[PDB]
Design a protein around this ligand. Structure first.
Ligand code: CLA
Ligand code: CLA
Ligand code: CLA
Ligand code: CLA
Ligand code: CLA
Ligand code: CLA
Ligand code: CLA
Ligand SMILES: CCCCCCCCCCCCCCCC(=O)OC[C@H](COP(=O)(O)OC[C@@H](O)CO)OC(=O)CCCCCCCCCCCCCCC
Ligand SMILES: CC1=C(/C=C/C(C)=C/C=C/C(C)=C\C=C\C=C(C)\C=C\C=C(C)\C=C\C2=C[C@H](C)[C@H](O)CC2(C)C)C(C)(C)C[C@@H](O)C1
Ligand SMILES: CC1=C(/C=C/C(C)=C/C=C/C(C)=C/C=C/C=C(C)/C=C/C=C(C)/C=C/C2=C(C)CCCC2(C)C)C(C)(C)CCC1
Ligand SMILES: CC1=C(C/C=C(\C)CCC[C@H](C)CCC[C@H](C)CCCC(C)C)C(=O)c2ccccc2C1=O
Ligand code: SF4
Ligand code: SF4
Lengths: 225, 142, 80, 139, 729, 75
């Protein structure tokens, strides 16, 4: 353990305390708060108390969990990246019959993992050569999946960055179109609720990110031993 | 003399070199040979891969036109049977209920009577039931 | 402060008054509806614009509308 | 001034701040027939006395939330709660209920203010009242 | 509180929202307290004077810094090897490694390298010594001073223009068409003839001797007699060396066509006849509208006359609508400016004008990307301000039955058919891309669906490209259009039929796929903007949206929830799609041109048909030089670009806090922080003046979008510059 | 046996069970908030540990927010 390990362990501490902050604030302030004094009557899962008081979006405990999911993802991603790079750089490798050890990444962790540029070039770029070049071999299913992971992530941003009023109006126009041809459904379509929109966004986001990381790790570790 | 930069794969050295190693998609051991002999009749680029022509010429009609009609018939079938089922289920005192619980007998009855969809649609348009007047449709404020 | 207006489509259903958490609305006698009562907003200086009153209104669109304007300490719901 | 006998509470950090003694605070008074437990809108639970009780809060919404809790969350209901606004100069303004009758029910002597005589769809067009400093509802 | 003086609602706010919303609504004069039409117009006029002065100051500063700390007088002696210098570097925080790395371009101090291509522009218009650059900078300073004083003066009470002077459309159109366009272009043609061309032919002409030497040996005699063909005789030969007299002609106005053999740019005499003819056309156009002499057309009569039997009222009363509304005019201007900016990019990357600018690939890439991004921004702004017009200025009774008010009659059909076309493009384009990706992944790339872009190849053939063997129109040497003896035909056909230039680059299947993807992006962004503009007045969910203004947060959680319902939200959504479409466009352009410059066109021709090729051969492959700008082993001149790359990757991510997390959480947190500050001994002595609050919802969306856009732009700018400079520069 | 020699299995098992743990902890927070909203009753929690938690929560959140800012900044 050295300087880089020190910094990464304290980064872990930071991310964990932040996730605990979000979840603990969600639990403690669920009943009520200074902003909303009767939050308990609105239930656990409600989107907002309205644009009043300057805006009361995401005050329920459910929204606190929704926000904590991202921070859990961030913390665990940093943890698994730390594990992977440190193991590849200082532990895993091969042994010569003399007794010397040759590590997978030649011990570059102790000097590159101290900057963000190191984590970009020497880890995300260098170790992705095994997954991007997987086409045409038995590892192609990972490469595909890798790209698939990079897609769904972006897809989720349609739901996190927007609101249901725009989609309701667009559905109104499309319903007019289906009405002109006498093909409108009896079950009137509606845009997803605010809570449902947040849930869909977080679910597709987590799925995309985790699938990306899984494909990356599997394709990398099936090419070194 | 169109496509002076394109040559048939049968006379393309890149395709001739690269077609000996075509993989087998199924367990059939000759599928690579079948693929090679079928793709020898197309127009290939300098990379030895077939290219398609969709300008409307009938010599390359199999490139787009035949699959075009093949798709169109099926899509029209699906749309027409869906619309017919919805229309017939509307006046059932619970059309919303029968949209989540499918009426299988009527659904299959509409499935079968759906191959003649183009003639039915043409007849319906001439009968005025395919479209509705703009004064009979909900509209949003301007 | 926010402005709360009640139009002539109110049916005197009193839902808006009960839904209001900051006691801005009131029921006053009227004649244009069967219930012979209508909604009034005498204390709009205490309205925070939470839109619960509109959410409770059962008439087509809204017989009660809330327009958000100048923000004061009361209308922003500040405790500090 | 006002009555007293505060409810038995251990205090909390969710109570009043500087604004209370610089801008305004709020008071709620009520008479309960038993010495029981209620939920403080500022976090925690407090015991309210048998007899008259007075409680100071920082927002009118908190006072009305406590009033709702008193009215609904007790088998012997409470209907005599009063909410005043306490100014930093000691001037006390009696806020709720305004006339003593609950606003949810019709009663004589009210003025019927804030009412438009037209539908929401008959509001004047924004362009016609341009450069008047008024939105369509304001006229 | 005094600030903001122009609004009283914001001035009585005790929180920090007062400052934010005072900054936000400062330059929206139409809603200030007690604002009249006359005062609004006069303030706009003065502010426009201000922007013009700022532009002139910016140009003067560019010129001055280039002349002071540049290497122009050495760049001219070897434009093909020396790197242009933008400005010097004075960073006290620099170390020795950065100092040694950034002492580039043969300088003696840390220095930047210009990628705006101003050296080529200055060389092409005849500036050969930095004293001329200095004189231009000082003259621009004086011009900016004059414009600032003009704004100040026309703001004075007795020089304050009237309202009718601001609503004289005919006179403004006449003066600005004939004078601002025609006369200015005529003067530019005169500058090119009298100065630029003689300097290109190795003759030094300045203010000291331009009044003596005539541009042509026969001055002004043939022009008045009618012997114009004299000026087109003896043009520059193909062996002409730019800046010297070796193999140079004496003609000044020619239609040579094609490109200069050496500089690979358009002939300057072609520029002269082009701008002169354009000036003549504009001067004829400027005498169209009557002002006060009876002769001329009146716009109101034209619009009211062109009524249609199918449109009910045609273009009736549109004159009053456009003249009374400022947002209508701003939308029209923004749309036109965006269209012609995209046109500028497209017609400049393929038809370079400045000398040796085609060789310098990094500057060409930067210019294309820059002006294309600006065009996208302007196109978004056009629709945004049109929606603002619909909210504020549109009158449903004055425009009754005209074309404008008839859009709202069939707006549902517009939005529905546009959504259908967007879905139809997206489904099948993504299907084809994913099909190619999967097919290549399974090791059988011969099963890709590869459509030849037949129609665009046919267009290239019509313009005279003989590679594809269509022999149609100019490619057909027997058609009438190719046998007219047009003077430009030989040179133009010579230029188009050589692969050495970007003029009508050869296209293939990947080009087809990416053009159809760009079409998807365009139609989708247009769908968002049009839906927002047409729904600005109201919809089924909010029939009275006009009474709420243009930018309001929501209508609360009632009626099923109404987040992001204002037209401002439509703008905020469409900005993302604009950014994504521009990303696709610029990625395509950059990859194709990297292949062209390196000569390895086969790489793009092969790997642009599936998305893994884009991910690997473009993103992964070219990033190698960039991210190694600084290493554990050292640092090179690309260090700043790597730092800015990471800076963009950071700001882009930072925008997601405001884009994802919403207000109530932060308000509760701020309440806790306020409690903490109020109870801390030695910290209660210092207390705030404006009560801290969380950012408002609309402010949150705007701030998140701003961080997002800044990161998006900076990341790609750094990547593009670094990759192209390391590979070639 | 033969697990540490199989690097892919080591990495996969580590990451998999850590993701499972993270999801479980987030669910703990969620269903604790659910309890607090639904099953909590003030009458049964007079001056107990839960009440005193609910009564100095501003101190908890403020000090935790400060430690989060400090850790983020310095780290
Ligand atoms: C601009 C776009 C465009 C469009 C819409 C078409 C459309 C068409 N082309 Mg075409 N074509 C184009 C550009 C285009 N072309 C260009 C640029 C070239 C030169 C490369 C050609 C060269 C070309 C040839 C050589 C031929 C066509 C033919 C046809 C027709 C096919 C008949 C069919 O499928 O309908 C029938 C559909 C149903 C029954 C359903 C169709 C009308 C064919 C023709 O003559 O048909 C009239 C034909 O032989 N095209
Ligand atoms: C001949 C007389 C004349 C002239 C020269 C002008 C000139 C001008 N008027 Mg104007 N005006 C006139 C008469 C005239 N006016 C009259 C009679 C009236 C009353 C009816 C007005 C009323 C009026 C108003 C109300 C306003 C103006 C404004 C302006 C300025 C617009 C700013 C601008 O973009 O210009 C620069 C534009 C160009 C140089 C040309 C546009 C460029 C086009 C798109 C082509 C691109 C060129 C080329 C392709 C690119 C070059 C590349 C190069 C850099 C390498 C401009 C200086 C505005 C202002 O505020 O100015 C202070 C304004 O608000 N005018
Ligand atoms: C539009 C801007 C502009 C301006 C300000 C000038 C200015 C000048 N030109 Mg020039 N010129 C221009 C455009 C311009 N030119 C263009 C576009 C061409 C086409 C190639 C020429 C071709 C040209 C030639 C061939 C000659 C000049 C000459 C001159 C000089 C004196 C003759 C003159 O113009 O009197 C104009 C006098 C008139 C009687 C014209 C009629 C009245 C007008 C309309 C007012 C003067 C410095 C002469 C020179 O250098 O001096 C020896 C000369 O020999 N010019
Ligand atoms: C000719 C150009 C032009 C002009 C004169 C106007 C004029 C106006 N616009 Mg408009 N607009 C334009 C172009 C233009 N627009 C374009 C191109 C767009 C598309 C993006 C828009 C989008 C737009 C919207 C969405 C809105 C307006 C509004 C307005 C009105 C004033 C309010 C305002 O924006 O000021 C205030 C402006 C700001 C606070 C902008 C500050 C943001 C800064 C400039 C970004 C800086 C980022 C960062 C610091 C960069 C640092 C980099 C570093 C870290 C490396 C006014 C009528 C508003 C309105 O409705 O008025 C009624 C409104 O809501 N405009
Ligand atoms: C990669 C991300 C992504 C994708 C794929 C889309 C896709 C779409 N957006 Mg979109 N959007 C995004 C990001 C994205 N968006 C972001 C970040 C924003 C900013 C907030 C927006 C803002 C936005 C607006 C404002 C609008 C859209 C619209 C659209 C639709 C237009 C049709 C189209 O372009 O292609 C066609 C559609 C696709 C290619 C998507 C379908 C992809 C799947 C694979 C098809 C098959 C379904 C699949 C089999 C289901 C399996 C599920 C099962 C496994 C559980 C489409 C659904 C517009 C719309 O509604 O059009 C009508 C519209 O108005 N979006
Ligand atoms: C890269 C993106 C990014 C960044 C930097 C942050 C940063 C932050 N988030 Mg955030 N967040 C993000 C994305 C991001 N978030 C996303 C995508 C979401 C969606 C789920 C959230 C959701 C979220 C929640 C729900 C919460 C946070 C919280 C926090 C804060 C944690 C305290 C901290 O780290 O110390 C402070 C910040 C930093 C150390 C950032 C680095 C700043 C640099 C290193 C220092 C700059 C030096 C100096 C300023 C230079 C001056 C230059 C001069 C010109 C002025 C911090 C402000 C928590 C909070 O409120 O704080 C406790 C919290 O509760 N965020
Ligand atoms: C022992 C584990 C456990 C148990 C028994 C429960 C039990 C319950 N939870 Mg809980 N929860 C858990 C773990 C658990 N949870 C965890 C780990 C989290 C953190 C994410 C949550 C977060 C959570 C929330 C936020 C909520 C509940 C709610 C509920 C209640 C029922 C409603 C519900 O979620 O069902 C219905 C569940 C679903 C419909 C989920 C199906 C959709 C999932 C997300 C898709 C998963 C896809 C999969 C991972 C991959 C597929 C890929 C695709 C391509 C096929 C019930 C008391 C709800 C409540 O308030 O009830 C009182 C509620 O709002 N829980
Ligand atoms: C390059 C993009 C190709 C697709 C773009 C858009 C696809 C659909 C465009 C059709 C326009 C809508 C139907 C025409 C709308 C319509 O029928 O208007 C009626 C109009 C007849 O005009 P009148 O002679 O009545 O008068 C026109 C003017 O005098 C006043 O408007 O028909 C056309 O002008 C059609 C051409 C519009 C172009
Ligand atoms: C009947 C039916 C329905 C309804 C259908 C309706 C109402 C349809 C209405 C259509 C309208 C109003 C308009 C349609 C316009 C169609 C156009 C403009 C077609 C253009 C075709 C072109 C340009 C052909 C182009 C080339 C043609 C040729 C094959 C070349 O090689 C390739 C290529 C692409 C160049 C549904 C939807 C209800 C259900 C369906 O199942 C059936
Ligand atoms: C809503 C609104 C708005 C907005 C909108 C927009 C802004 C639009 C745009 C639009 C656009 C932006 C459009 C464009 C168009 C274009 C065009 C129309 C073009 C054309 C072209 C042509 C026609 C060409 C031709 C040719 C060729 C091809 C070749 C040869 C030559 C020639 C030239 C012949 C406004 C503000 C206005 C107003 C109010 C309302
Ligand atoms: C796109 C979008 C919509 C529109 C999306 C809608 C209406 C959902 C449409 C879903 C379709 C009908 C089905 C797709 C999902 C199914 C689970 C797929 C099942 C596949 C099997 C049958 C194989 C919202 O309603 C919304 C609401 C709040 C915030 C953001 C958004 C948002 O971004
Ligand atoms: S809820 Fe609506 S209808 Fe009922 S009393 Fe109030 S304003 Fe009238
Ligand atoms: S934007 Fe949505 S979540 Fe926020 S206050 Fe409005 S309705 Fe509620």
């Amino acid at each position: 353990l050295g300087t880089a390990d020190f910094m990464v362990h304290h980064i872990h501490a930071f991310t964990i305390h932040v996730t605990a902050l979000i979840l603990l604030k969600g639990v403690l302030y669920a009943r009520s708060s200074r902003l909303v004094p009767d939050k308990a009557n609105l239930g656990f899962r409600f989107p907002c108390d309205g644009p009043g008081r300057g805006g009361t979006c995401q005050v329920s405990g459910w929204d606190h969990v929704f926000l904590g999911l991202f921070w859990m993802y961030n913390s665990l991603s940093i943890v698994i990246f730390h594990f992977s790079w440190k193991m590849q750089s200082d532990v895993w490798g091969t042994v010569s019959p003399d007794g010397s050890v040759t590590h997978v990444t030649l011990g570059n962790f102790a000097q590159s993992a101290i900057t963000i540029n190191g984590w970009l070039r020497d880890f995300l770029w260098a170790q992705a050569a095994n997954v991007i070049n997987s086409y045409g071999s038995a590892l192609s299913a990972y490469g595909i999946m890798f790209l698939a992971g990079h897609f769904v992530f972006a897809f989720s941003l349609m739901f996190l960055f927007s609101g249901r009023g725009y989609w309701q109006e667009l559905i109104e126009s499309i319903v007019w179109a289906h009405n002109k041809l006498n093909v409108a459904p009896a079950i009137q379509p509606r845009a997803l609720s605010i809570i449902q929109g947040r849930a869909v966004g977080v679910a597709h986001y987590l799925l995309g990110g985790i699938v990306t990381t899984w494909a990356f790790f599997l394709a990398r570790s099936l090419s070194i031993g | 003399d169109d496509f002076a930069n394109l040559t048939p794969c049968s006379e393309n050295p890149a395709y001739l070199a690269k077609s000996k190693n075509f993989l087998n998609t199924t367990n059939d051991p000759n599928s690579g040979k079948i693929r090679a002999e079928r793709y020898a009749s197309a127009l290939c680029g300098p990379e030895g891969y077939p290219h398609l022509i969709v300008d409307g010429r009938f010599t390359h009609a199999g490139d787009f036109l035949i699959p075009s009609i093949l798709f169109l018939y099926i899509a029209g079938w699906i749309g027409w049977v869906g619309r017919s089922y919805l229309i017939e289920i509307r006046e059932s005192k619970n059309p919303e209920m029968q949209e989540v619980v499918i009426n299988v007998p009527l659904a299959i009855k509409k499935m079968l009577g759906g191959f003649l969809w183009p003639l039915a649609a043409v007849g319906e348009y001439t009968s005025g039931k395919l479209v509705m007047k703009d004064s009979e449709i909900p509209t949003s404020p301007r | 402060s926010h402005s709360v207006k009640i139009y002539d489509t109110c049916i005197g259903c009193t839902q808006c008054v009960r839904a209001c958490p900051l006691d801005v609305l009131e029921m006053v006698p009227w004649d244009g509806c069967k219930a012979a009562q209508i909604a009034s907003s005498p204390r709009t200086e205490d309205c925070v614009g939470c839109k619960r009153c509109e959410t409770a209104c059962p008439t087509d669109f809204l017989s009660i509308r809330v327009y958000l304007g100048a923000e004061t300490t009361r209308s922003m719901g500040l405790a500090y | 001034e006002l009555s007293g006998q505060p409810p038995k509470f251990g205090g909390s950090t969710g109570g009043l701040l500087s604004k209370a003694n610089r801008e305004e605070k709020y008071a709620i008074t009520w008479t309960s027939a038993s010495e029981q437990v209620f939920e403080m809108p500022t976090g925690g639970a407090a015991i309210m006395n048998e007899g008259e009780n007075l409680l100071y809060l920082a927002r009118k919404e908190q006072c009305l939330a406590l009033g709702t809790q008193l009215r609904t969350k007790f088998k012997p209901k409470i209907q005599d709660y009063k909410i005043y606004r306490v100014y930093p100069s000691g001037e006390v303004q009696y806020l709720h209920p305004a006339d003593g009758v609950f606003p949810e029910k019709v009663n004589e002597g009210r003025e019927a203010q804030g009412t438009k005589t037209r539908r929401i769809g008959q509001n004047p067009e924004p362009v016609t009242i341009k450069f008047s400093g008024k939105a369509p509802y304001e006229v | 509180t005094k600030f903001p003086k122009f609004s009283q609602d914001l001035a009585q706010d005790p929180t920090t929202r007062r400052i934010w919303y005072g900054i936000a609504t400062a330059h929206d004069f139409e809603t200030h307290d007690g604002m009249t039409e006359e005062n609004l117009y006069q303030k706009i006029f003065a502010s426009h004077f201000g922007h013009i002065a700022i532009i002139f100051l910016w140009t003067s500063g560019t010129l001055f810094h280039v002349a002071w700390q540049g290497n122009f007088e050495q760049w001219i002696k070897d434009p093909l090897n020396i790197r242009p210098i933008a400005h010097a570097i004075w960073d006290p925080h620099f170390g020795e490694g950065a100092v040694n790395a950034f002492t580039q371009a043969g300088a003696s101090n840390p220095v930047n390298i210009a990628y705006s291509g101003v050296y080529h522009w200055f060389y092409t218009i005849g500036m050969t010594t930095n004293q001329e650059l200095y004189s231009g900078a000082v003259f621009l300073l004086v011009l900016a001073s004059l414009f600032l004083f003009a704004g100040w003066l026309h703001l004075q009470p007795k020089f304050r223009p009237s309202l009718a002077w601001f609503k004289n459309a005919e006179s403004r159109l006449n003066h600005h068409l004939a004078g601002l366009f025609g006369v200015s272009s005529l003067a530019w043609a005169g500058h090119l003839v009298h100065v630029a061309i003689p300097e290109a032919r190795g003759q030094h002409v300045g203010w000291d001797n331009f009044l003596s030497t005539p541009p042509h040996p026969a001055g002004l005699m043939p022009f008045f007699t009618g012997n114009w063909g004299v000026y087109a005789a003896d043009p520059d030969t193909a062996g002409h060396i730019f800046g010297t007299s070796e193999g140079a002609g004496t003609a000044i106005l020619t239609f040579l066509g094609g490109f200069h053999p050496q500089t690979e740019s358009l002939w300057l005499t072609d520029i002269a006849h082009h701008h002169l003819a354009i000036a003549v056309i504009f001067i004829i156009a400027g005498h169209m509208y009557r002002t006060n002499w009876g002769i001329g057309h009146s716009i109101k009569e034209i619009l009211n006359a062109h009524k249609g039997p199918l449109t009910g009222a045609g273009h009736t009363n549109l004159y009053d609508t456009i003249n009374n509304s400022l947002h209508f005019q701003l939308g029209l201007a923004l749309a036109s400016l965006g269209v012609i900016t995209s046109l500028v990019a497209q017609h400049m990357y393929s038809l370079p004008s400045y000398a040796f600018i085609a060789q310098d690939h990094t500057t060409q890439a930067a210019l294309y990307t820059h002006h294309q991004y600006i065009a996208g921004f302007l196109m978004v702004g056009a629709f945004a301000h049109g929606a603002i017009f619909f909210v504020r200025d549109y009158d449903p009774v004055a425009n009754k039955d005209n074309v404008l008010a008839r859009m709202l009659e069939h707006k549902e059909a517009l939005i529905s058919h546009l959504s259908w076309v967007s879905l139809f493009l997206g489904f099948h384009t993504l299907g084809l891309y994913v099909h190619n990706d999967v097919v290549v992944a399974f090791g059988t790339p011969e099963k890709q669906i590869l459509i030849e872009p037949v129609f665009a190849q046919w267009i290239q053939a019509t313009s005279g490209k003989a590679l594809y063997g269509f022999d149609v129109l100019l490619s057909n040497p027997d058609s009438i259009a190719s046998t007219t003896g047009a003077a430009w035909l030989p040179g133009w056909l010579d230029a188009i039929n050589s692969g050495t230039n970007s003029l009508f680059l050869t296209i293939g299947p990947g080009d087809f796929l990416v053009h159809h993807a760009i079409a998807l992006g365009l139609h989708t962004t247009a769908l968002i903007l049009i839906k927002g503009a047409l729904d600005a007045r109201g919809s089924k969910l909010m029939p009275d949206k006009k009474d709420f203004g243009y930018s309001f947060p929501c209508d609360g959680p009632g009626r099923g929830g109404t987040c992001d319902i204002s037209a401002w939200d439509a703008f905020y959504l469409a900005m993302f799609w604009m950014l994504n479409t521009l990303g696709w466009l610029t990625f395509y352009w950059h990859w194709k041109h990297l292949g062209v410059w390196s000569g390895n066109v086969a790489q793009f021709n092969e790997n642009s048909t599936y998305l893994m090729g884009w991910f690997r051969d473009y993103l992964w492959a070219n990033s190698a030089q960039l991210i190694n700008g600084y290493n554990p082993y050292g640092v090179n001149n690309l260090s700043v670009w790597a730092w800015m790359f990471l800076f963009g990757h950071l700001v882009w991510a930072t925008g997601f806090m405001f884009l994802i997390s919403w207000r109530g959480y932060w308000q509760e947190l701020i309440e806790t922080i306020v409690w903490a500050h109020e109870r801390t001994p030695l910290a209660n002595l210092v207390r705030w003046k404006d009560k801290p609050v969380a950012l408002s919802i609309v402010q949150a969306r705007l701030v998140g979008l701003a961080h997002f856009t800044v990161g998006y732009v900076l990341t790609y700018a750094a990547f593009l510059i670094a990759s192209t400079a390391g590979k070639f520069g | 046996p033969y697990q540490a020699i199989d690097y892919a299995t080591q990495l996969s098992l580590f990451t998999h069970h850590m993701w499972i743990g993270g999801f479980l902890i987030v669910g703990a927070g969620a269903h604790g908030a659910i309890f607090m909203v639904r099953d909590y009753d003030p009458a049964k929690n007079v001056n107990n540990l839960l009440d005193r938690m609910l009564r100095h929560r501003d101190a908890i959140i403020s000090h935790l927010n400060w430690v989060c800012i400090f850790l983020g900044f310095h780290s």
